[PDB]
């Protein structure tokens, strides 16, 4: 059973590559992880210098195998039922009216760490947008992930929107496509319909002179 290895604090290696019209970087995070009470705590690092883009679209991208999933439910808990060997998750976030993000990541064990390798792709941005502009505001996010099963690829997809408000006031919606696929090929558990009630909470670091962003997350499996 891989939910055996999420009944403490897990620590969590986040390693990312990415290229946004041309603009190469890299994130690294670290910190921990509580299915118990879906917390996770966070810290990313601009390994190159200066991210390129807005952190917080960053944020879904940069391990809902750390939510909460009620007892009731945890004969849906995809995510933690891979685990040791992991999976492969995908996604594909639309920027209304600006280029999009194409990203592969891995989310598996190495020994006691939760790793999350991704690969990010993002193309069609707008150099004058809301993203490679920088006018998205940097404070919370907040919303429902709905999950469905997915028995050809015998893993999940999932869809959401994420709506970043913009400095104007305004909003820039952001539309995320989700398709998880077990790294092993051991019986993993395929859910019925529910979702992830997700928050995180953005901030800086006083100390830290690194582009950054320190994340405090909770994420809540419900919907049946």
């Not at 150099?127 to 429902?144: F, Q, T, V």
Request: glycine share 8%.
């Amino acid at each position: 059973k891989g939910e055996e290895l999420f009944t403490g604090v897990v620590p969590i290696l986040v390693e990312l590559d990415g290229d946004v019209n041309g603009h190469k970087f890299s994130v690294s995070g670290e910190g921990e992880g509580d299915a118990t009470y879906g917390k996770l705590t966070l810290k990313f690092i601009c390994t190159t210098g200066k991210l390129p883009v807005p952190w917080p679209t960053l944020v879904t991208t940069l391990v809902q195998c750390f939510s909460r999933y009620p007892d009731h439910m945890k004969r849906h808990d995809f995510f933690k039922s891979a685990m040791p060997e992991g999976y492969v998750q995908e996604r594909t976030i639309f920027f209304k009216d600006d280029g999009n993000y194409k990203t592969r990541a891995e989310v598996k064990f190495e020994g006691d760490t939760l790793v999350n390798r991704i690969e990010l792709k993002g193309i069609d941005f707008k150099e004058d947008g809301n993203i490679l502009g920088h006018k998205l505001e940097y404070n919370y996010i907040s919303h429902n992930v709905y999950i469905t099963a997915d028995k050809q690829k015998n893993g999940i997809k999932a869809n959401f929107k994420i709506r970043h408000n913009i400095e104007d006031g305004s909003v820039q919606l952001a539309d995320h496509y989700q398709q998880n696929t077990p790294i092993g090929d051991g019986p993993v558990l395929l859910p019925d319909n529910h979702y992830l009630s997700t928050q995180s909470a953005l901030s800086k670091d006083p100390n830290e002179k690194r582009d950054h962003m320190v994340l405090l997350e909770f994420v809540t499996a419900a919907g049946i």
